Amino acid sequence: EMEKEFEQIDKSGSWAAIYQDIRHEASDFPSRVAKLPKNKNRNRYRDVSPFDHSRIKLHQEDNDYINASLIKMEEAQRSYILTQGPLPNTVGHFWEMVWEQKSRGVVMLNRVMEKGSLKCAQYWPQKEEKEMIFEDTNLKLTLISEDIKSYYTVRQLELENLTTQETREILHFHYTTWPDFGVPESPASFLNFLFKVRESGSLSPEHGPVVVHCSAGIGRSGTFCLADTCLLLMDKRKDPSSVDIKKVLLEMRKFRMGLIQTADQLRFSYLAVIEGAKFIM
Numbered sequence: 001e002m003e004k005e006f007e008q009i010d011k012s013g014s015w016a017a018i019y020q021d022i023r024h025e026a027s028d029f030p031s032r033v034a035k036l037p038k039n040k041n042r043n044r045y046r047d048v049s050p051f052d053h054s055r056i057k058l059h060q061e062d063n064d065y066i067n068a069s070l071i072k073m074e075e076a077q078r079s080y081i082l083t084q085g086p087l088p089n090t091v092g093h094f095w096e097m098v099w100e101q102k103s104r105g106v107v108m109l110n111r112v113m114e115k116g117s118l119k120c121a122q123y124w125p126q127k128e129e130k131e132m133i134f135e136d137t138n139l140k141l142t143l144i145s146e147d148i149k150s151y152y153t154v155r156q157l158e159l160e161n162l163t164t165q166e167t168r169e170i171l172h173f174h175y176t177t178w179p180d181f182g183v184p185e186s187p188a189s190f191l192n193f194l195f196k197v198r199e200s201g202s203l204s205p206e207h208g209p210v211v212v213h214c215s216a217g218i219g220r221s222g223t224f225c226l227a228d229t230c231l232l233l234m235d236k237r238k239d240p241s242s243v244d245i246k247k248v249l250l251e252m253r254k255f256r257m258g259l260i261q262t263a264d265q266l267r268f269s270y271l272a273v274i275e276g277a278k279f280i281m
């Protein structure tokens, strides 16, 4: 049982050690498309690239490239798109991806500014009466409503395909209280947030995959998907304690590199699953 493994690693202070074995066992697949010179300004970080095998392709004939990966968890029957925080020049590609994949939710785990630097472009409207038009991808985005809570904000957005005049409602879930350094002290508000996403229908098989991002789309984004998938597998299985968080993480790392950036994010992921298991047993 993971709770006792938690006890052992914590008492022995073997978090980094565990983290390094995960790093060494992690898959390495080609990322040739990401490294083409015509795509250099589509990548926020030169060392964070989607693998070619799992990369999301845009349906535009010119350049299909976005820094986004499909993570397919076959036993849990859950998919996620993990992406970077859009850049000033990829906001239109971001919303084209949302459209093309039939996503119902966008999960944002960062602030636009952290540590005095921009981590993401402002890619959604701040006021109902000031909608955004992405001329490169022929999309219009309107803020419908905004519900601001202590730990997170939920926004209803209308995305319109200006080409076909079809519209969809997109939910934006914005976790606003992840600290600039380290991880939250308690997983309580992160679990609350994860249950609110689930309750919305955004993670359900009747929609395209949820879009999940932070700045790079590997650290906090990784923690979100890892906790969700582990708790779902504990619901599904005859024996809940058969769920090994290290194996799930390695299965998720076949689809996108570097998921869970620090030993502190790993320890936080265990804490989130262990605490969330109580509210599921």
Ligand SMILES: COC[C@H]1N(S(C)(=O)=O)[C@H]2CC[C@]1(O)CC2
Pocket (backbone or CB within 6 Å): 009, 010, 012, 013, 014, 015, 016, 017, 263, 264, 267
């Ligand atoms: C308490 O988290 C594990 C800590 N260790 S340890 C000795 O348990 O691996 C190192 C110092 C800070 C850390 O948070 C991460 C590295």
